[PDB]
Amino acid sequence: ASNFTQFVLVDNGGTGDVTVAPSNFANGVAEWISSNSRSQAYKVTCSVRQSSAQNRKYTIKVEVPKVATQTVGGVELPVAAWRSYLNMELTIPIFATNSDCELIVKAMQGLLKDGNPIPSAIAANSGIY
Amino acid sequence: SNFTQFVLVDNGGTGDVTVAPSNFANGVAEWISSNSRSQAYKVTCSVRQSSAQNRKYTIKVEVPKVATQTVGGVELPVAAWRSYLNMELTIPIFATNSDCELIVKAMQGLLKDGNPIPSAIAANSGIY
Amino acid sequence: SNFTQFVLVDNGGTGDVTVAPSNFANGVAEWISSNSRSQAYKVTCSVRQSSAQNRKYTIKVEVPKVATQTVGGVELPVAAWRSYLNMELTIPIFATNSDCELIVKAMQGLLKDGNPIPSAIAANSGIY
Amino acid sequence: ASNFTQFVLVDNGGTGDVTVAPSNFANGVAEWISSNSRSQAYKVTCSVRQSSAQNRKYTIKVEVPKVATQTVGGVELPVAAWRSYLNMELTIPIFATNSDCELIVKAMQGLLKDGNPIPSAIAANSGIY
Amino acid sequence: SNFTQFVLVDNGGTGDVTVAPSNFANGVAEWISSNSRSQAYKVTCSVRQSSAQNRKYTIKVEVPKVATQTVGGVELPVAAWRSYLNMELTIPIFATNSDCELIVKAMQGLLKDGNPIPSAIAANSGIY
Amino acid sequence: SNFTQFVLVDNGGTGDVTVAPSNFANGVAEWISSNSRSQAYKVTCSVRQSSAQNRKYTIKVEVPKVATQTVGGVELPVAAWRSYLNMELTIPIFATNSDCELIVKAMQGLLKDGNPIPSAIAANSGIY
């Protein structure tokens, strides 16, 4: 019943889906990577800690690479042209029940739902106006 | 124009939480729900050129604690009743529109129901 | 594999308290119940080689105060609502499996119903 | 109606049971020992004190010896090859009623019940995974 | 999850040596066989980013010689001696899954029965 | 004689990588695959008396990535990068042939298909 399982990070409709699988749990940080070389792989990391006496903090990081082939010293190597970084920090009081956490999760899901302002602004290289 | 209201929490039509625009000072968009500022859902979004090669999106979400809450009452301490989400998205300036759509899809798939991270968050648990 | 859920408090089938796995960071197993983290039963267990000749088990149990409690509410101060058990078991490296079973039986018989220590704890009393 | 009585520490099913009996109450520490020499005897100690203004702390210690015969200077002596130590510290708020203490006791009993993860891990010289 | 129990020495069903996870402190996974710790097989594995382009694996295995020590009439389960294996594998970050599979295949074929190195080790001899 | 040709990478008849003896200078045996030396697999083995009671084996394997370099219009067969394996096995002089066979069996079972370490190496990942 472990939750350290693989999941589809980018859903392209069956074909072309990006899937990340568990790869590391050292130092209390769970890590997911895609089935590529580590210089061209998507990376997802999650960790939870007791920040204050009455607060718990989640730290989630996502790395989205742009794959490319670079010629270094006459030899072609698989590299990433650039990487997009997502940094998420969620602080939840210790008094929050399971229903409150479900509310937080639903709010996070609805924040980035297709058609909403913020995802549309991100996908259009524009701000909110 | 995209500064409109949207359903932040979807409950199947009944009980939906809708956040409407409430502030645009300094170019930062803000959405709040029909509640007091101590018990409301707040979403803020802004984008800026962080470095010479990167653009950074700053998204902040505030979620109230609903269980055993008093609507319109004074609930103290504040830190014991509010959940804070601070999301930062760094995109290099070379990314096209399709790359941004791919990043958006990755973010959506990260928090899709049934995936490890949302299940861990929703169960007051970590990764095991 | 032994990282599974188990009945922490047995009430004869009805009202049983079950703790399920919730964290495995740094190799430390953690169990919590279906409650908020301020009102839940928490069990953590870890084993390490403390010295050159001994292995040490560290077991920590947290029990909430149930009498006159508000389910899902903010109860302060924290120290007035939680009971903390910190158990440390030191086993020399020369102990076989049978020796470990004997130690487990000794620990079980120490807290068996009717024995002095559990009766003293359950009656808010000492040894008289 | 005193609770300073003897009890079976290790229940081997009638035959071979290890029984500890009261032996000392000096300096506020109740002590149980088995009917052996003090170099080969099981020892159980319990004490309660008012740690803070609103907290009470129980201190329970159990010693499990491994009996052996050692030849020192040509003479055989009853000693213990090694000793296993259990240290328990239980902090209970002063606002906890008898029902809350019964809940704590039941949780402690169910933590070490046969078949549960922690006792199985201890009895198998392994951790939790 | 790969932090599970596995057979270290395969003796054909009966007499197999099995190691179970025991500790994951400081990012170093550890496997220990059952029974007395003094006469137990130990396997440790850890992976780190050595350089900007390389990832290094560190694997250690200890094989004990089971014996009984008698000093002054006291019998203790100990190990007469231990054999220590230290493996260090460096893999560049440009290696794909196929490259890692090929490296694993090479490592397996290095110690396959009938090959020079395992035959030399099993015969208490070198290369001749 | 064990200083013979053997298959390093078994690809099922076709595509097998074979290494042949090339040098035995200073007590270090060396195996090199055919064709260009720049894109050749290298295996070296040497055994020495490290201490008064221990014998140490030193085994090194290099796996190249075959590539073609073009500088100024001149094409040369080179290796884009190489993976280096360093193994050091210490065996006490008290070990018999059975003990050495058991050590070899342990080494083979460490890298057997399906086991944690080879699966991690072949998947470009660590222990999770």
What's the oligomerization state? part of a larger assembly
CATH topology (level 3) name of chain A: MS2 Viral Coat Protein
CATH superfamily of chain A: MS2 Viral Coat Protein
In the CATH hierarchy, what is the class of chain A?
Alpha Beta
Measured as a percent range, the helix fraction of chain A is: 10-25%
Number of domains of chain A: 1
> Beta-sheet strand percentage of chain A?
over 45%
* Radius of gyration of CA atoms of chain A, rounded to a whole number: 18 Å
* Overall body shape of chain A: globular
Distance between the termini of chain A: 45 Å
Total beta strands of chain A = 6
Strand order of the largest sheet of chain A: 1-2-3-4-5-6
Largest sheet of chain A: 6 strands, antiparallel
- Decide which structural class fits the backbone of chain A: alpha+beta
| Helix segment tally of chain A | 2
Largest interface: pair, residues per side = A-B, 76 and 75 residues
Order of helices and strands of chain A: EEEEEEHH
* CATH architecture assignment of chain A: 2-Layer Sandwich
PDB class: virus like particle
Keywords: MS2, virus, virus like particle
Entry title: MS2-pMS2 Icosahedral Reconstruction
Chains A, B, C, D, E, F: Capsid protein
Short note summarizing the structure:
The PDB classes it as virus like particle. This is part of a larger assembly, with six copies of chain A. By secondary structure, the first copy, chain A, is an alpha+beta fold.
Note down, in words, how this protein is organized.
This is part of a larger assembly, with six copies of chain A. Chain A is α+β, with helices and mostly antiparallel strands and 129 residues long. Chain A has one domain: MS2 Viral Coat Protein, CATH 3.30.380.10. The first copy, chain A, is 16% helix and 49% strand. Chain A is globular. In chain A, 41% of the residues are buried. Chains in contact: A-B, A-C, A-E, A-F, B-C, C-D, C-E, D-E, E-F. Chains A and B meet through strand 1, strand 4, strand 5, strand 6 and helix 1 of A and strand 1, strand 4, strand 5, strand 6 and helix 1 of B. Strand 6 (82-92) of chain C pairs antiparallel with strand 6 of chain D, so a sheet runs across the interface. Chains A, D: Belongs to the Leviviricetes capsid protein family. Chains A, D: Pfam families: Levi_coat (PF01819).
